[PDB]
Protein backbone atom coordinates (compact mmCIF):
# COMPACT_ATOMS: atom_id res chain seq x y z
CA UNK A 1 0.00 0.00 0.00
CA UNK A 2 2.87 2.41 0.89
CA UNK A 3 2.80 5.97 2.30
CA UNK A 4 1.32 9.20 0.91
CA UNK A 5 3.81 12.09 0.74
CA UNK A 6 3.45 15.72 -0.38
CA UNK A 7 5.63 18.74 -1.02
CA UNK A 8 3.74 22.04 -0.78
CA UNK A 9 5.54 25.18 -1.93
CA UNK A 10 4.59 28.83 -2.38
CA UNK A 11 7.38 30.30 -4.46
CA UNK A 12 6.74 33.97 -3.59
CA UNK A 13 7.10 36.48 -0.76
CA UNK A 14 5.49 39.80 0.19
CA UNK A 15 2.09 40.59 1.65
CA UNK A 16 0.73 41.31 -1.84
CA UNK A 17 1.30 37.61 -2.66
CA UNK A 18 -0.95 36.57 0.25
CA UNK A 19 -2.86 34.21 -2.11
CA UNK A 20 0.09 31.85 -2.81
CA UNK A 21 0.63 31.02 0.87
CA UNK A 22 -3.14 30.83 1.37
CA UNK A 23 -3.50 28.26 -1.48
CA UNK A 24 -0.72 26.11 -0.02
CA UNK A 25 -2.13 26.30 3.52
CA UNK A 26 -5.50 25.24 2.08
CA UNK A 27 -3.89 22.21 0.40
CA UNK A 28 -2.34 21.27 3.74
CA UNK A 29 -5.79 21.20 5.36
CA UNK A 30 -7.03 18.81 2.64
CA UNK A 31 -4.14 16.41 3.25
CA UNK A 32 -4.55 16.54 7.05
CA UNK A 33 -8.25 15.73 6.83
CA UNK A 34 -7.39 12.92 4.40
CA UNK A 35 -5.09 11.12 6.88
CA UNK A 36 -1.76 12.27 5.39
CA UNK A 37 0.84 12.57 8.14
CA UNK A 38 2.83 15.73 8.94
CA UNK A 39 6.11 13.78 8.82
CA UNK A 40 5.32 13.15 5.15
CA UNK A 41 4.18 16.69 4.19
CA UNK A 42 7.09 19.04 3.39
CA UNK A 43 5.98 22.70 3.52
CA UNK A 44 7.74 25.67 1.95
CA UNK A 45 6.11 29.01 2.74
CA UNK A 46 7.77 32.34 3.38
CA UNK A 47 5.67 32.96 6.52
CA UNK A 48 5.30 36.72 6.20
CA UNK A 49 1.50 36.72 5.94
CA UNK A 50 -0.08 35.58 9.22
CA UNK A 51 1.61 38.15 11.44
CA UNK A 52 2.18 40.80 8.78
CA UNK A 53 1.54 44.38 9.91
CA UNK A 54 -0.97 44.70 7.07
CA UNK A 55 -2.85 41.55 8.07
CA UNK A 56 -6.23 42.71 9.48
CA UNK A 57 -6.62 39.30 11.23
CA UNK A 58 -3.27 38.41 12.90
CA UNK A 59 -2.62 34.65 13.08
CA UNK A 60 -5.30 33.97 10.43
CA UNK A 61 -5.06 33.26 6.70
CA UNK A 62 -8.15 32.57 4.59
CA UNK A 63 -8.32 31.25 1.02
CA UNK A 64 -11.95 32.27 0.48
CA UNK A 65 -14.30 35.07 1.71
CA UNK A 66 -15.86 33.68 4.89
CA UNK A 67 -13.38 30.77 4.85
CA UNK A 68 -11.76 28.95 7.77
CA UNK A 69 -8.27 29.79 9.04
CA UNK A 70 -6.06 27.66 6.78
CA UNK A 71 -2.91 28.69 8.67
CA UNK A 72 -3.63 26.80 11.91
CA UNK A 73 -1.59 23.62 12.30
CA UNK A 74 0.38 24.03 9.06
CA UNK A 75 3.96 22.70 9.57
CA UNK A 76 6.72 24.93 8.32
CA UNK A 77 9.77 23.08 7.03
CA UNK A 78 11.39 25.85 4.97
CA UNK A 79 10.58 29.52 5.53
CA UNK A 80 12.18 32.84 4.57
CA UNK A 81 15.18 32.51 2.26
CA UNK A 82 15.41 28.75 2.95
CA UNK A 83 12.89 28.49 0.10
CA UNK A 84 15.31 28.27 -2.84
CA UNK A 85 16.14 25.91 -5.73
CA UNK A 86 18.74 24.01 -3.67
CA UNK A 87 16.39 23.05 -0.83
CA UNK A 88 13.36 22.48 -3.07
CA UNK A 89 15.19 20.10 -5.42
CA UNK A 90 17.07 18.40 -2.56
CA UNK A 91 13.73 17.86 -0.78
CA UNK A 92 12.25 16.22 -3.89
CA UNK A 93 15.32 14.00 -4.40
CA UNK A 94 15.32 13.10 -0.68
CA UNK A 95 18.97 14.20 -0.26
CA UNK A 96 19.13 15.33 3.39
CA UNK A 97 22.83 16.14 3.20
CA UNK A 98 22.20 18.76 0.51
CA UNK A 99 19.69 20.79 2.61
CA UNK A 100 20.83 24.17 3.98
CA UNK A 101 18.63 25.48 6.78
CA UNK A 102 15.03 24.61 7.60
CA UNK A 103 13.88 21.40 9.29
CA UNK A 104 15.72 18.85 7.15
CA UNK A 105 12.49 17.10 6.14
CA UNK A 106 12.84 15.56 2.63
CA UNK A 107 11.19 12.91 0.42
CA UNK A 108 12.76 9.80 1.97
CA UNK A 109 10.35 7.68 -0.06
CA UNK A 110 10.06 3.94 -0.77
CA UNK A 111 9.11 2.19 -4.08
CA UNK A 112 5.40 1.80 -3.22
CA UNK A 113 4.89 5.40 -2.02
CA UNK A 114 2.74 8.10 -3.65
CA UNK A 115 3.97 11.68 -4.05
CA UNK A 116 1.84 14.77 -4.48
CA UNK A 117 3.58 18.05 -5.29
CA UNK A 118 1.80 21.37 -5.27
CA UNK A 119 3.52 24.59 -6.36
CA UNK A 120 1.86 28.01 -6.26
CA UNK A 121 3.37 31.41 -7.29
CA UNK A 122 5.83 32.11 -13.51
CA UNK A 123 7.15 33.02 -16.96
CA UNK A 124 8.04 30.98 -20.11
CA UNK A 125 10.45 28.25 -18.97
CA UNK A 126 10.64 29.25 -15.27
CA UNK A 127 8.76 29.55 -11.98
CA UNK A 128 9.52 31.87 -9.09
CA UNK A 129 11.45 31.51 -5.87
CA UNK A 130 11.19 34.30 -3.23
CA UNK A 131 14.56 35.59 -4.46
CA UNK A 132 16.53 35.01 -7.64
CA UNK A 133 17.70 32.57 -8.83
CA UNK A 134 14.36 31.29 -10.13
CA UNK A 135 13.66 27.65 -11.10
CA UNK A 136 14.19 26.83 -14.79
CA UNK A 137 12.27 24.01 -16.52
CA UNK A 138 15.41 21.99 -17.32
CA UNK A 139 16.62 22.14 -13.71
CA UNK A 140 13.23 20.97 -12.36
CA UNK A 141 12.83 18.20 -14.94
CA UNK A 142 16.40 16.93 -14.39
CA UNK A 143 15.68 16.49 -10.66
CA UNK A 144 12.45 14.69 -11.55
CA UNK A 145 14.44 12.40 -13.89
CA UNK A 146 17.02 11.65 -11.17
CA UNK A 147 14.26 10.83 -8.68
CA UNK A 148 12.65 8.47 -11.22
CA UNK A 149 16.02 6.74 -11.78
CA UNK A 150 16.12 6.00 -8.03
CA UNK A 151 12.82 4.09 -8.29
CA UNK A 152 11.86 5.36 -4.82
CA UNK A 153 8.17 6.03 -5.54
CA UNK A 154 5.28 4.29 -7.28
CA UNK A 155 3.76 7.39 -8.88
CA UNK A 156 3.80 11.18 -8.59
CA UNK A 157 1.21 13.90 -9.29
CA UNK A 158 2.51 17.48 -9.71
CA UNK A 159 0.12 20.47 -9.74
CA UNK A 160 1.49 23.85 -10.80
CA UNK A 161 -0.27 27.18 -10.22
CA UNK A 162 1.82 29.74 -12.17
CA UNK A 163 1.84 31.90 -15.30
CA UNK A 164 2.81 29.92 -18.43
CA UNK A 165 2.80 26.83 -16.18
CA UNK A 166 2.70 24.30 -19.03
CA UNK A 167 6.09 25.64 -20.16
CA UNK A 168 7.73 23.86 -17.22
CA UNK A 169 6.77 20.45 -18.66
CA UNK A 170 5.92 20.86 -22.36
CA UNK A 171 8.12 18.53 -24.43
CA UNK A 172 10.41 17.82 -21.44
CA UNK A 173 8.55 15.67 -18.92
CA UNK A 174 9.00 11.93 -19.80
CA UNK A 175 5.77 9.96 -20.23
CA UNK A 176 6.79 6.58 -18.80
CA UNK A 177 8.23 7.38 -15.33
CA UNK A 178 4.88 7.54 -13.50
CA UNK A 179 4.86 11.34 -13.23
CA UNK A 180 1.65 13.15 -14.12
CA UNK A 181 1.59 16.98 -14.20
CA UNK A 182 -1.39 19.36 -14.30
CA UNK A 183 -0.86 23.09 -14.91
CA UNK A 184 -3.17 26.09 -14.33
CA UNK A 185 -2.30 27.40 -17.78
CA UNK A 186 -0.68 26.47 -21.10
CA UNK A 187 2.88 27.62 -21.91
CA UNK A 188 1.52 30.79 -23.58
CA UNK A 189 -1.08 31.95 -21.04
CA UNK A 190 -1.03 33.85 -17.78
CA UNK A 191 -3.13 32.51 -14.93
CA UNK A 192 -5.90 34.42 -13.20
CA UNK A 193 -6.22 35.67 -9.63
CA UNK A 194 -9.57 35.53 -7.85
CA UNK A 195 -11.30 36.60 -4.61
CA UNK A 196 -10.26 40.22 -5.03
CA UNK A 197 -11.43 43.33 -3.06
CA UNK A 198 -14.92 44.24 -4.33
CA UNK A 199 -16.37 40.70 -4.61
CA UNK A 200 -19.51 40.14 -2.41
CA UNK A 201 -19.06 39.18 1.27
CA UNK A 202 -15.36 40.16 1.06
CA UNK A 203 -13.95 40.72 4.62
CA UNK A 204 -13.21 44.41 5.42
CA UNK A 205 -9.73 45.95 5.43
CA UNK A 206 -8.30 43.43 2.96
CA UNK A 207 -6.57 45.02 -0.01
CA UNK A 208 -5.17 41.71 -1.35
CA UNK A 209 -6.67 38.86 -3.35
CA UNK A 210 -7.25 35.70 -1.30
CA UNK A 211 -6.65 33.01 -3.93
CA UNK A 212 -5.78 31.97 -7.48
CA UNK A 213 -8.57 30.92 -9.81
CA UNK A 214 -7.26 27.49 -10.81
CA UNK A 215 -6.09 26.76 -7.26
CA UNK A 216 -9.30 27.55 -5.40
CA UNK A 217 -11.26 25.72 -8.11
CA UNK A 218 -9.39 22.41 -7.59
CA UNK A 219 -9.00 22.93 -3.83
CA UNK A 220 -12.72 23.59 -3.29
CA UNK A 221 -13.41 20.54 -5.47
CA UNK A 222 -11.23 18.40 -3.16
CA UNK A 223 -13.21 19.64 -0.12
CA UNK A 224 -16.55 18.72 -1.68
CA UNK A 225 -16.39 14.98 -2.46
CA UNK A 226 -15.41 11.53 -1.32
CA UNK A 227 -12.03 11.44 -3.02
CA UNK A 228 -12.20 7.70 -3.56
CA UNK A 229 -14.98 8.43 -6.05
CA UNK A 230 -13.19 11.11 -8.08
CA UNK A 231 -10.11 10.48 -10.22
CA UNK A 232 -7.33 12.95 -11.03
CA UNK A 233 -8.58 12.76 -14.65
CA UNK A 234 -12.13 13.71 -13.63
CA UNK A 235 -10.80 16.72 -11.69
CA UNK A 236 -8.77 17.70 -14.76
CA UNK A 237 -11.92 17.70 -16.93
CA UNK A 238 -14.10 19.36 -14.26
CA UNK A 239 -11.64 22.19 -13.55
CA UNK A 240 -10.59 22.63 -17.20
CA UNK A 241 -14.23 23.17 -18.27
CA UNK A 242 -15.00 25.36 -15.24
CA UNK A 243 -12.25 27.94 -15.92
CA UNK A 244 -11.97 27.65 -19.74
CA UNK A 245 -12.91 31.37 -20.00
CA UNK A 246 -9.78 32.21 -18.00
CA UNK A 247 -6.95 29.85 -18.99
CA UNK A 248 -6.36 26.42 -20.56
CA UNK A 249 -5.76 23.80 -17.86
CA UNK A 250 -3.02 21.61 -19.32
CA UNK A 251 -1.66 18.12 -18.56
CA UNK A 252 1.75 16.47 -19.18
CA UNK A 253 3.69 13.30 -18.36
CA UNK A 254 2.25 9.84 -17.75
CA UNK A 255 -1.42 10.52 -18.50
CA UNK A 256 -2.64 7.02 -17.31
CA UNK A 257 -1.52 7.92 -13.75
CA UNK A 258 -4.50 10.32 -13.63
CA UNK A 259 -6.82 7.30 -13.69
CA UNK A 260 -6.12 6.92 -9.93
CA UNK A 261 -8.66 8.30 -7.46
CA UNK A 262 -7.57 11.58 -5.84
CA UNK A 263 -7.61 9.61 -2.56
CA UNK A 264 -4.52 7.71 -3.67
CA UNK A 265 -2.63 11.05 -3.29
CA UNK A 266 -4.73 13.06 -0.84
CA UNK A 267 -6.78 10.56 1.18
CA UNK A 268 -10.39 11.52 1.85
CA UNK A 269 -12.22 13.37 4.64
CA UNK A 270 -14.42 10.80 6.50
CA UNK A 271 -17.09 13.50 6.82
CA UNK A 272 -17.58 13.39 3.02
CA UNK A 273 -18.08 9.60 2.71
CA UNK A 274 -21.61 9.92 1.24
CA UNK A 275 -20.68 12.72 -1.20
CA UNK A 276 -20.20 10.60 -4.32
CA UNK A 277 -18.68 12.53 -7.22
CA UNK A 278 -21.09 13.10 -10.09
CA UNK A 279 -20.10 13.31 -13.76
CA UNK A 280 -16.73 12.63 -15.36
Ligand X SMILES: *[C@@H]1O[C@H](CO)[C@@H](O[C@@H]2O[C@H](CO)[C@@H](O[C@H]3O[C@H](CO)[C@@H](O)[C@H](O)[C@@H]3O)[C@H](O)[C@H]2NC(C)=O)[C@H](O)[C@H]1NC(C)=O
Ligand Y SMILES: *[C@@H]1O[C@H](CO)[C@@H](O)[C@H](O)[C@H]1NC(C)=O
- Residues annotated as catalytic are 121, 163
The rounded distance, in Å, linking the Cα atoms of 252 and 187 is 12
Identify what 97 binds: ligand X, ligand Y, none; CB under 5 to 8 Å per kind.
ligand Y
The rounded distance, in Å, linking the Cα atoms of 118 and 70 is 16
The DSSP-derived string for 113-178 is: -EEEEEEESEETTEE--SSSSPEEHHHHHHHHHHHHHHT--SEEEEEEESTTGGGGTTTTS-SSSS
* Size of interface with ligand Y, in residues (CB under 6 A): 8
Indicate the residue whose CB is closest to ligand Y: 98
Q: Is position 110 an interface residue for ligand Y (rule: CB under 6 A)?
A: no
* 6-28 CB burial, b ≥16 within 10 A, e <16: bbbbbbbbeeebbbbbbbbbbbb
Residue 96 CB, nearest approach to ligand Y (Å): 8
Q: Which stretch binds ligand Y (CB under 6 A): 2-10, 17-25, 154-162, 180-188?
A: 180-188
Q: Is the Cβ of residue 244 or residue 271 nearer to ligand Y in the bound state? A: 244
Contact 183, 256 (CB under 8 A): no
Q: Is position 205 an interface residue for ligand X (rule: CB under 6 A)?
A: no
The rounded distance, in Å, linking the Cα atoms of 203 and 205 is 7
Q: Is position 188 an interface residue for ligand Y (rule: CB under 6 A)?
A: yes
Q: Is the Cβ of residue 53 or residue 280 nearer to ligand X in the bound state? A: 53
Q: Is position 52 an interface residue for ligand X (rule: CB under 6 A)?
A: yes
Q: Is the Cβ of residue 15 or residue 136 nearer to ligand X in the bound state? A: 15
* Alpha-carbon distances of 78 from 119, 156, 188, rounded to whole Å: 14, 21, 31
**Binding residue for ligand X, selected from 42, 43, 45, 48, defined by CB under 6 A:** 48
Q: Is position 85 an interface residue for ligand Y (rule: CB under 6 A)?
A: no
Q: Is the Cβ of residue 79 or residue 143 nearer to ligand X in the bound state? A: 79
Binding site residues, ligand X, CB under 6 A = 14-15, 48, 51-54
Amino acid sequence: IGTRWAVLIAGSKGYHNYRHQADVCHMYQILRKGGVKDENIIVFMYDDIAYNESNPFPGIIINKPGGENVYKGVPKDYTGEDINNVNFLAAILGNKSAIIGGSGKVLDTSPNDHIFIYYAXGAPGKIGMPSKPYLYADDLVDTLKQKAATGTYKSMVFYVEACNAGSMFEGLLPEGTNIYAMAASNSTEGSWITYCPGTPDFPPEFDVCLGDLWSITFLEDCDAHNLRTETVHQQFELVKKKIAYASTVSQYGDIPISKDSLSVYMGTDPANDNRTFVDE
